[PDB]
Structure formats: structure tokens, C-alpha cells
Amino acid sequence: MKTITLYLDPASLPALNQLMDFTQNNEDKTHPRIFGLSRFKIPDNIITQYQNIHFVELKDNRPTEALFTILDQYPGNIELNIHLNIAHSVQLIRPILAYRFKHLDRVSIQQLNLYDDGSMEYVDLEKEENKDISAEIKQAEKQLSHYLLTGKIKFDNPTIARYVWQSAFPVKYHFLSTDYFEKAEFLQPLKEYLAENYQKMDWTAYQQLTPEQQAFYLTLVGFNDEVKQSLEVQQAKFIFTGTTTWEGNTDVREYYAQQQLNLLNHFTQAEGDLFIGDHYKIYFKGHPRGGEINDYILNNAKNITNIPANISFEVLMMTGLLPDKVGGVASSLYFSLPKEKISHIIFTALNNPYVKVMRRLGIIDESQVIFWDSLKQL
Ligand SMILES: OC[C@H]1O[C@@H](O[C@H]2[C@H](O)[C@@H](O)[C@@H](O)O[C@@H]2CO)[C@H](O)[C@@H](O)[C@H]1O
Numbered sequence: 436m437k438t439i440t441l442y443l444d445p446a447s448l449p450a451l452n453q454l455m456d457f458t459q460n461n462e463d464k465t466h467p468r469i470f471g472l473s474r475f476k477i478p479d480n481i482i483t484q485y486q487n488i489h490f491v492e493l494k495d496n497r498p499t500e501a502l503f504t505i506l507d508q509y510p511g512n513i514e515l516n517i518h519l520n521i522a523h524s525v526q527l528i529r530p531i532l533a534y535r536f537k538h539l540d541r542v543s544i545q546q547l548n549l550y551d552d553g554s555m556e557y558v559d560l561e562k563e564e565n566k567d568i569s570a571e572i573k574q575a576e577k578q579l580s581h582y583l584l585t586g587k588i589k590f591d592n593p594t595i596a597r598y599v600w601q602s603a604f605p606v607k608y609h610f611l612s613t614d615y616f617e618k619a620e621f622l623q624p625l626k627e628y629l630a631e632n633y634q635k636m637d638w639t640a641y642q643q644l645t646p647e648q649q650a651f652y653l654t655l656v657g658f659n660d661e662v663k664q665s666l667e668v669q670q671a672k673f674i675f676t677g678t679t680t681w682e683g684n685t686d687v688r689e690y691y692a693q694q695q696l697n698l699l700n701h702f703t704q705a706e707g708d709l710f711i712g713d714h715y716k717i718y719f720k721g722h723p724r725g726g727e728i729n730d731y732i733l734n735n736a737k738n739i740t741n742i743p744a745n746i747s748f749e750v751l752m753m754t755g756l757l758p759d760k761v762g763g764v765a766s767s768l769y770f771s772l773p774k775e776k777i778s779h780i781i782f783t784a785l786n787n788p789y790v791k792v793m794r795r796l797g798i799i800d801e802s803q804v805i806f807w808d809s810l811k812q813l
């Protein structure tokens with residue numbers, strides 16, 4: 436019948452893996468594709484090369500009703516090939532299942548490919564440390580079953596629910612950390628349950644594409660020549676990475692802005708706690724959703740070369756353009772960065788789930804961790 440490919444992600448890391456999927460499968464100009472990537476604008480010159488190509492907005496972590504207008508265009512039996520954010524998988528598939536409900540006879544779910552949002556999945560798993568994971572799976576399995584038959588979301592364990600899709604669909608997980616599932620002893624039943632339905636995110640994907648596909652991908656992720664040449668400088672490089680807050684609260688937005696500027700100053704100034712040297716070129720790699728937090732850095736910093744916030748950090752590792760050193764606020768980008776390039780990771784005590792994930796992984800050592808409120812105003 437007809438296979439329809441849906442690419443869905445309100446965040447960054449899954450959309451990045453999914454655009455690699457699109458690249459590897461881009462010889463096919465007619466395969467039906469729906470792009471719900473909040474953080475990614477397919478270039479119009481590329482859009483015109485394709486047909487059966489669609490775009491849907493996401494709101495509240497899920498495709499809007501406009502998804503239905505698009506699917507209505509394929510009146511035959513359709514099998515949906517779905518790519519999702521793991522943390523948001525339940526919401527993202529919500530409207531698809533509501534469409535399926537109305538068109539049971541002709542609409543099926545072929546397969547799921549799922550990708551980590553990032554650290555969030557691991558932070559949340561860390562909170563599941565003192566629970567019977569075995570029992571939790573079997574309960575989530577049952578509750579997923581009720582979701583698929585009523586369309587109603589009710590989960591006793593919303594975290595573990597994100598990993599029981601194989602009880603209903605052919606599934607593949609792509610993990611930022613397969614080492615997490617191995618080292619976290621409490622999660623062994625999960626690891627075993629997932630069996631061979633998971634792999635690690637493959638960062639070597641880009642070097643195995645053809646030159647034409649490589650340029651194609653860089654055009655998807657917004658990685659222009661200007662940025663390429665800005666990083667090829669004949670000098671040692673430090674990239675300062677920013678963060679963002681998921682709180683529209685103005686006072687908090689400005690606080691993050693103020694603290695992050697102060698953090699940079701600890702890195703780049705002589706009097707700083709994290710002073711790196713005088714012999715580094717300084718770059719700002721802002722969070723893609725930083726917004727006014729990113730603006731605050733640019734407006735208030737000096738001798739700083741901006742790498743536009745929209746380019747994901749991992750693209751620099753695709754293209755072998757990693758700097759000498761990287762420091763900043765704890766980020767999903769630190770999970771896949773070679774350990775030799777970590778200057779310092781800062782967290783926004785002993786029982787911080789995020790500190791624990793990164794301690795478990797070897798990303799930060801037995802080191803007395805650095806919170807950003809623990810730093811003097813320079
Ligand atoms: O919406 C994309 C981002 O979601 C963030 O998670 C939010 C969530 O969307 C919101 O509804 C509420 O639950 O707060 C969460 C953060 O605690 C993710 O953190 C981010 O990675 C994106 O997926």
C-alpha cells in the first residue's frame with residue numbers, strides 16, 4: 436500500500452538524527468514525508484526538489500489538527516513510518532492515534548523509530564532508582580494498551596511508559612547513552628527487556644554519506660561556509676556553550692541571562708575560577724531556544740565570535756571542527772563530546788539527578804561539582 440514517513444520533534448537532538456534519516460533516503464523524490472520539526476526550517480530550494488512533502492506545526496508537544504488535512508490526502512491504505520522524540524513520544528503519537536481511530540480500516544502504524552530528547556531521558560530515569568523496574572514495565576505495558584484502545588493517556592510511570600512501545604509496534608530506539616543502560620544496575624531489567632530493539636545514536640553517519648549528501652545535510656542543519664571558516668582559524672579555540680530555561684517567567688529568564696554571562700566571565704577572565712588561558716579564541720554557542728539569554732551574552736560580552744544558536748553542537752563533530760576546549764552549562768551536547776575537550780561543566784549537591792547521570796557516565800569525575808550560583812559576581 437502506501438508508506439507515509441513522519442518526522443516529529445519539538446526539540447533538537449531527535450530532529451538532527453531524523454534529518455540524517457531524510458538525507459540517507461533523499462534519492463527518492465516522491466516518498467510521502469511530513470516534517471514536524473519545530474526547530475528546523477527545510478530550505479525552499481530543497482522543498483521544491485520533492486513532492487508529497489508536508490509540514491505540520493507542533494503545539495503542546497504534539498502535531499496540531501492540521502495533521503488530519505494532510506493525511507486526508509492519501510485516501511488509500513496508509514502505513515505510518517513514525518520518527519519520535521522519546522521523552523514526548525506519548526503526546527506526539529496522540530493525534531496520530533486519534534486519526535487512526537477514525538480510519539481504522541485503512542490507517543496502520545508500520546514502525547517507530549525513537550530518539551533521545553537528550554539528558555532529560557536520563558535525568559528522569561535516574562529518579563526511577565529505588566523502584567522495581569521489572570514491575571513498572573509490565574504496568575506501563577498494560578497502561579499503554581488502554582491508551583491504544585481508548586486514546587486516553589493515564590500512566591502510573593510516565594518515564595517508563597516511554598520505553599514500552601515494542602509491546603505494540605515494531606520499534607527501534609536510538610540512545611544518546613547505551614552506556615547508561617549498562618552502568619545503572621537498577622535498570623538491568625529495562626536493558627534486558629529492550630533486548631536488540633535499541634542502538635546508540637551513530638555520529639559516524641555523516642562521514643559515510645556521499646559528498647552530495649554531506650552538503651545536503653549541512654544545508655538542513657543550517658551549517659553555512661561562514662561558520663566553517665570561522666572555526667578553521669589557526670589558533671587554539673574555546674567554545675562557551677549556553678543553556679535556556681523552560682519557564683516563560685521573565686524574572687527567571689533574566690536571572691539565567693545574568694548568571695550565564697557571569698559564567699563566561701569565570702572562563703575567560705584572569706580572575707575567573709575557570710580561567711582557561713589568554714591564548715584561546717572564544718566562541719559563543721548559544722542554546723537554540725536561548726532567545727533573550729543569547730542576546731544578553733552577545734550584547735554584554737567581548738572578544739566573542741558567535742556560532743548561530745540554531746546550529747547543533749554535534750554538527751561540529753560531524754564535520755571534525757571540534758575546538759580544543761568546551762565549557763558551559765550542563766547540556767545534552769556533553770554526552771557525545773570526547774572527554775579530552777571538556778574544560779568544565781556547570782549545573783544550574785549530591786542528590787541532583789543530572790549530576791548523578793554525568794557521574795555515572797564518567798563525564799564528570801569525583802570532582803566537587805560546580806553550581807552556577809556558587810560563583811562570585813565578577
Ligand atoms: O517542548 C520541547 C522541549 O520540552 C522540554 O520539556 C518541557 C516540556 O515541554 C514542558 O511541557 C514541561 O513539562 O517542562 C519540560 C521541562 O521540564 C525539554 O526539556 C526540551 O528538551 C524540549 O524537548
Ligand SMILES: Nc1ccn([C@@H]2O[C@H](COP(=O)(O)O)[C@@H](O)[C@H]2O)c(=O)n1
Nearest residue numbers: 447676677720721722747748766767768
Ligand atoms: N548551547 C547549546 C545547547 C544545546 N544545543 C543542542 O541542543 C540539544 C539539547 O541540548 P540541551 O540538553 O542543552 O537542551 C543538544 O544535543 C545540542 O544539540 C547546542 O547545539 N548548543
